[PDB]
Write a protein that holds these residues in place. Structure first.
Motif, PDB file in Angstrom:
ATOM      1  N   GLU A 213       0.817  -1.126   0.095  1.00 16.71           N
ATOM      2  CA  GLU A 213      -0.089   0.097  -0.166  1.00 16.71           C
ATOM      3  C   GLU A 213       0.948   1.195   0.002  1.00 16.71           C
ATOM      4  O   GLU A 213       0.711   2.164  -0.718  1.00 16.71           O
ATOM      5  CB  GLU A 213      -0.872  -0.017   1.331  1.00 16.71           C
ATOM      6  N   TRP A 214       1.835   1.305   0.813  1.00  9.59           N
ATOM      7  CA  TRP A 214       2.807   2.397   0.871  1.00  9.59           C
ATOM      8  C   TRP A 214       3.329   2.627  -0.518  1.00  9.59           C
ATOM      9  O   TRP A 214       3.658   3.808  -0.895  1.00  9.59           O
ATOM     10  CB  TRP A 214       3.845   2.498   2.117  1.00  9.59           C
ATOM     11  N   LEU A 215       4.115   1.546  -0.947  1.00 12.72           N
ATOM     12  CA  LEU A 215       4.646   1.472  -2.372  1.00 12.72           C
ATOM     13  C   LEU A 215       3.704   2.167  -3.334  1.00 12.72           C
ATOM     14  O   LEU A 215       4.303   2.997  -4.112  1.00 12.72           O
ATOM     15  CB  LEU A 215       5.380   0.112  -2.613  1.00 12.72           C
ATOM     16  N   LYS A 216       2.556   1.781  -3.376  1.00 12.65           N
ATOM     17  CA  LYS A 216       1.700   2.083  -4.459  1.00 12.65           C
ATOM     18  C   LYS A 216       1.360   3.663  -4.184  1.00 12.65           C
ATOM     19  O   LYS A 216       1.416   4.466  -5.277  1.00 12.65           O
ATOM     20  CB  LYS A 216       0.361   1.515  -4.338  1.00 12.65           C
ATOM     21  N   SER A 217       1.442   4.140  -3.012  1.00 10.65           N
ATOM     22  CA  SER A 217       0.922   5.403  -2.634  1.00 10.65           C
ATOM     23  C   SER A 217       2.213   6.431  -3.205  1.00 10.65           C
ATOM     24  O   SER A 217       2.100   7.470  -3.650  1.00 10.65           O
ATOM     25  CB  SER A 217       0.959   5.698  -0.881  1.00 10.65           C
ATOM     26  N   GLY A 218       3.406   5.851  -3.017  1.00  7.64           N
ATOM     27  CA  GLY A 218       4.605   6.581  -3.457  1.00  7.64           C
ATOM     28  C   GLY A 218       5.289   7.346  -2.149  1.00  7.64           C
ATOM     29  O   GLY A 218       6.514   7.993  -2.362  1.00  7.64           O
ATOM     30  N   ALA A 219       4.860   7.043  -1.076  1.00  3.87           N
ATOM     31  CA  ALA A 219       5.204   7.659   0.172  1.00  3.87           C
ATOM     32  C   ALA A 219       6.852   7.501   0.434  1.00  3.87           C
ATOM     33  O   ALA A 219       7.551   6.887  -0.400  1.00  3.87           O
ATOM     34  CB  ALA A 219       4.488   7.142   1.348  1.00  3.87           C
ATOM     35  N   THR A 220       7.356   7.926   1.340  1.00  4.64           N
ATOM     36  CA  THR A 220       8.748   7.716   1.548  1.00  4.64           C
ATOM     37  C   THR A 220       9.125   6.940   2.813  1.00  4.64           C
ATOM     38  O   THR A 220       8.127   6.547   3.572  1.00  4.64           O
ATOM     39  CB  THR A 220       9.277   9.256   2.063  1.00  4.64           C
ATOM     40  N   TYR A 221      10.208   6.128   2.792  1.00  2.00           N
ATOM     41  CA  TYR A 221      10.407   5.097   3.924  1.00  2.00           C
ATOM     42  C   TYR A 221      10.492   5.654   5.109  1.00  2.00           C
ATOM     43  O   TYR A 221       9.938   4.984   5.859  1.00  2.00           O
ATOM     44  CB  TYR A 221      11.916   4.462   3.379  1.00  2.00           C
ATOM     45  N   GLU A 222      10.972   6.806   5.221  1.00  3.72           N
ATOM     46  CA  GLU A 222      11.110   7.304   6.441  1.00  3.72           C
ATOM     47  C   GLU A 222       9.795   7.855   7.068  1.00  3.72           C
ATOM     48  O   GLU A 222       9.322   7.531   8.211  1.00  3.72           O
ATOM     49  CB  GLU A 222      11.716   8.738   6.327  1.00  3.72           C
ATOM     50  N   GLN A 223       8.821   8.543   6.129  1.00  2.00           N
ATOM     51  CA  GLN A 223       7.447   8.882   6.661  1.00  2.00           C
ATOM     52  C   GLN A 223       6.703   7.390   7.098  1.00  2.00           C
ATOM     53  O   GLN A 223       5.838   7.328   7.982  1.00  2.00           O
ATOM     54  CB  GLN A 223       6.746   9.238   5.446  1.00  2.00           C
ATOM     55  N   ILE A 224       7.099   6.356   5.942  1.00  8.31           N
ATOM     56  CA  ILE A 224       6.226   5.085   6.513  1.00  8.31           C
ATOM     57  C   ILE A 224       6.761   4.725   7.858  1.00  8.31           C
ATOM     58  O   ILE A 224       5.721   4.054   8.767  1.00  8.31           O
ATOM     59  CB  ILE A 224       6.578   4.110   5.266  1.00  8.31           C
ATOM     60  N   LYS A 225       7.975   4.452   8.269  1.00  6.97           N
ATOM     61  CA  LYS A 225       8.578   3.802   9.319  1.00  6.97           C
ATOM     62  C   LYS A 225       7.854   4.910  10.520  1.00  6.97           C
ATOM     63  O   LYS A 225       7.620   4.323  11.409  1.00  6.97           O
ATOM     64  CB  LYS A 225       9.741   3.918   9.574  1.00  6.97           C
ATOM     65  N   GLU A 226       8.027   6.503  10.274  1.00  2.68           N
ATOM     66  CA  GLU A 226       7.372   7.226  11.335  1.00  2.68           C
ATOM     67  C   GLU A 226       6.037   6.660  11.741  1.00  2.68           C
ATOM     68  O   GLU A 226       5.737   6.567  12.934  1.00  2.68           O
ATOM     69  CB  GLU A 226       7.508   8.491  10.609  1.00  2.68           C
ATOM     70  N   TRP A 227       5.198   6.517  10.851  1.00  2.67           N
ATOM     71  CA  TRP A 227       3.805   6.144  11.116  1.00  2.67           C
ATOM     72  C   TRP A 227       3.606   4.884  11.767  1.00  2.67           C
ATOM     73  O   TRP A 227       2.996   4.752  12.692  1.00  2.67           O
ATOM     74  CB  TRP A 227       2.779   5.920   9.676  1.00  2.67           C
ATOM     75  N   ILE A 228       4.504   3.974  11.365  1.00  3.09           N
ATOM     76  CA  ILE A 228       4.693   2.675  11.877  1.00  3.09           C
ATOM     77  C   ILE A 228       4.794   2.749  13.666  1.00  3.09           C
ATOM     78  O   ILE A 228       4.589   2.089  14.256  1.00  3.09           O
ATOM     79  CB  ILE A 228       5.634   1.647  11.434  1.00  3.09           C
ATOM     80  N   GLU A 229       6.239   3.413  13.916  1.00  2.00           N
ATOM     81  CA  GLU A 229       6.714   3.825  14.883  1.00  2.00           C
ATOM     82  C   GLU A 229       5.707   4.391  16.103  1.00  2.00           C
ATOM     83  O   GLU A 229       5.430   4.125  17.087  1.00  2.00           O
ATOM     84  CB  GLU A 229       7.829   4.043  15.104  1.00  2.00           C
TER      85      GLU A 229
ATOM     86  N   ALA B 207       2.365   4.454  15.782  1.00  5.78           N
ATOM     87  CA  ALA B 207       1.120   3.658  15.896  1.00  5.78           C
ATOM     88  C   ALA B 207       1.463   2.693  17.170  1.00  5.78           C
ATOM     89  O   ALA B 207       0.945   2.565  18.115  1.00  5.78           O
ATOM     90  CB  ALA B 207       0.663   2.839  14.971  1.00  5.78           C
ATOM     91  N   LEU B 208       2.939   1.902  17.100  1.00  4.87           N
ATOM     92  CA  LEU B 208       3.347   1.029  18.041  1.00  4.87           C
ATOM     93  C   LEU B 208       3.549   1.812  19.467  1.00  4.87           C
ATOM     94  O   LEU B 208       3.088   1.076  20.241  1.00  4.87           O
ATOM     95  CB  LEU B 208       4.693   0.628  17.780  1.00  4.87           C
ATOM     96  N   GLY B 209       4.066   2.994  19.378  1.00  9.90           N
ATOM     97  CA  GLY B 209       3.975   3.737  20.719  1.00  9.90           C
ATOM     98  C   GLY B 209       2.571   3.905  21.341  1.00  9.90           C
ATOM     99  O   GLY B 209       2.449   3.689  22.559  1.00  9.90           O
TER     100      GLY B 209
END
Length: 50
Positions: free
Chosen positions: A28-44, A46-48
């Motif tokens: 999903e993120w790859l299709k969107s074209g987002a950035t690797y940094e932004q994607i981990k940011e969201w992930i981390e 949510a985890l917190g």
């Protein structure tokens, strides 16, 4: 895909685990074209929160 996984691992282990658990999210993120940094940011963030 391998490069994407390596990058996530280098940044954090939690990010890597999340990507492995939900390959769909990775796609999903790859299709969107987002950035690797932004994607981990969201992930981390949510985890917190969880």
């Amino acid at each position: 895909m391998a490069g994407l996984l390596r990058f996530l691992l280098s940044k954090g282990r939690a990010l890597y685990n999340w990507a492995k658990s939900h390959v769909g999210k990775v796609w999903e993120w790859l299709k969107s074209g987002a950035t690797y940094e932004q994607i981990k940011e969201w992930i981390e963030n949510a985890l917190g929160w969880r």
